[PDB]
Amino acid sequence: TQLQEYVRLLLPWCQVNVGSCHFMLAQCYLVAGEGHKALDCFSQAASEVEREDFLEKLIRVEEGESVSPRLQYYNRVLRLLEDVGLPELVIQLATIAIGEAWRSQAALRTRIFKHHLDMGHNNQAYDALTQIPDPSRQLDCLRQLVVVLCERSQLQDLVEFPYVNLHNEVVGIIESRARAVDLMTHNYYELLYAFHIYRHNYRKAGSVMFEYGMRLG
Amino acid sequence: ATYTVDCEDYVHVVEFNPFAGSLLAYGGISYVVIASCRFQEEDSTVEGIEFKTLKTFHHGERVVAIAWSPETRCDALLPLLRFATAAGDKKIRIFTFQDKNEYKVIEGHSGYINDLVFCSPEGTDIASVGDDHTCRIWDLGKQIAMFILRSPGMSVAWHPEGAFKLMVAEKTGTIRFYDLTTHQAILSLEMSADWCVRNTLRIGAVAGNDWIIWEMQDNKPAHADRRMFRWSKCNENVFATTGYPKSQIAIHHPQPILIGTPVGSGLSWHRRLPLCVVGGYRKLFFWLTEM
Amino acid sequence: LPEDDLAISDEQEPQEAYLECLFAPGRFTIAAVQKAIQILRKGSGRVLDLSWEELRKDVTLTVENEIQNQEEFRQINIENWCKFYTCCLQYQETLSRPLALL
């Protein structure tokens, strides 16, 4: 409240106005629930002050600056907005952090999985989902993330995007999903939507999945 | 009860009042999605209202704030729509996807643009306020005005039924009454400020949640109570507030908390008052309120 | 030396400038300002339970409420603030009496 009262004074004469002050305006606005104004301050000001011992506030930036270089500013703000639960703004900064960009990539990418999973909303990024199995065997990232997108549960739209996704990946992801469909849930529809993916392919497994569902019933 | 739709991208929400009149605009990262309010329900229970996502307009830049122009029309299927918009790069634009007016450069704002409004004279006026400490008028031959504010302009709105006067809310808390036509600073008072009724009332809302009511005796506020104020369009006395960071939505005129959803991005009232449109992170929502 | 004038607009309008020049002089106490507020009103101890900013607002609002309506309004508003400043200082100079040195 006291920080919020004095916020106007953190912007004064131009010679006395620094990126560290603006980064403080942004945090004050996060604490006081002014998440829009916090973003405006984070976007305009950059913290590229990796070695400033004086401010305890910079430690969270600096902990990643000791690991990594300047894309770390967006990676930090990404995490800060995760910590306060603002999940549209988090995602944009994760995308900014990749676009501003070996060990660093792997750590940031494992964060991207954790952070994208928790929000669920940014996890509609299908071409990004497809761009993960083609480089390497991180199929399990797609498997858990597409399940959270199935939890969002817009199956017409949801099944149309695996038309874009490569059929080799779609067969492994949809078969892995179909084994998860054997959940014994009251969601009868999951078998029918599996039958539609089987319809696209050789169709053979849709008949077998029906006898399996008959047996349980 | 309520009607709910998932949304891919979300920012600010405005409802269409200046003229197509049952349609809704969602500010987004790419640009704006236009939805239609449809009265129909197939069950034959009425006063159940759905959103149809008609189309996504693309700009390639984030829309922070949007207002509709009365110049919008609907023909035989094709919607002719005009928007006054705020973009991430501190631009105020007028969209027709035939053309886009740009206001930027030296003449434009060099700070974040908090708010924008549109009004209709014998021509059309766009007013906008920024963190640059300016209020700008755009007249639609292109004429511009640049006025200094004492502190960053958080909100701006024109006098309803009286296009010449406007309100500015400065972040410092000064509320100013501006007449572009006459002497610029007509009056002053000490999150947003806005008008109510046929401008018969003036509101002033702080982020600490104190709120002032003026029936524009001395200039002292007539009454005051306790977020950012969102005005009920038809009823002067019905007043809406929200908890952005949860989802507590309060309707004030005692203290009712009518709605509790997740985070709330932005919300607005339906063109005739029956619904409130709410944008959350993943979803857009129609809530019916009665009384 | 203290000097005072009208304002074109750089250091705001006279009301703001007189409010700062009344709160800031080193010959000022709260009780003398509160006693001066009583002269342009009524009241007594109830001004003690006000915040420092609320006290600034009551002084400023009291001066504005008296003045009625551009040039005469500015002149009359300056004079009321000058009278108030003088009255506050006069009650205060009773305090400037020294009592002891330790």
Is chain A in touch with chain B: ≥3 Cβ pairs within 8 A?
yes
Least Cα distance to B142 among B79, B68, B92 occurs for: B92
**Cβ distance B137 to B180 under 8 Å?**
yes
Does C13 touch chain B if contact means CB atoms closer than 8 Å?
A: no
Q: Is-contact A29 B245, C-beta < 8 A?
A: no
DSSP state of A190: H
Contact (CB<8Å) B218/C65: yes
Q: Which residues contact B72 (CB under 8 A, 6 or more apart)?
A: B16, B18, B19, B20, B79, B80, B81, B82
User: CA B176, CA C48: separation in Å to the nearest integer?
Assistant: 32
CA B90, CA A208: separation in Å to the nearest integer?
A: 59
Q: Which tokens belong to B120?
A: 């209709």
Greatest distance between any 2 Cα atoms in chain C? 54
- Do B149 and B175 contact (CB within 8 A), yes or no? no
* Calpha distance B265→B246 (Å, rounded): 12
Burial code (b: 16+ CB inside 10 Å, e: under 16) for A137-161 equals eeeebbeebbbebbebeeeeebeeb
- Contact B290/B252 with Cβ under 8 angstroms? no
Measured distance CA(B173)–CA(B186) in Å, rounded? 17
- State how far residue B121 is from chain A, nearest Cα, in angstroms: 32
CA-nearest residue to A90 within chain B is B281
For this entry, resolution in Å reads 5.5
Sign of the CA dihedral B245, B249, B250, B256?
A: negative
Q: Could you tell me which residues are beta bridge partners of residue B25?
A: B14, B34
Give me the residues paired with residue B14 across strands: B25
Element holding C75 (H helix, E strand): helix C71-93
Give CA–CA dist B235/B273, Å, rounded: 8
The alpha carbon of residue B113 is apart from the nearest alpha carbon of chain C, in Å, by 24
Distance (Å) from the C-alpha of residue C23 to the closest C-alpha of chain B?
18
d(CA A157, CA B6): 12
- DSSP letters of B79-118? EE--EEEEETTTEEEEE----EEEE-TTTS-SS-EEEEEE
SS3 content of chain A, % helix, strand, coil (to 5): 70, 0, 30
Helices A189-200 and A167-181: crossing angle in degrees, nearest 10, is: 160
Q: Which chains touch A (3 or more CB pairs under 8 A)?
A: B
Tokens of A140: 């399990």
Determination method here? cryo-EM
**What 3 state SS string does A10-62 have?**
HCCCHHHCCHHHHHHHHHHHHHCCCHHHHHHHHHHCCCCCCCCCCCHHHHHHH
CB atoms C65 and B150 under 8 Å: no
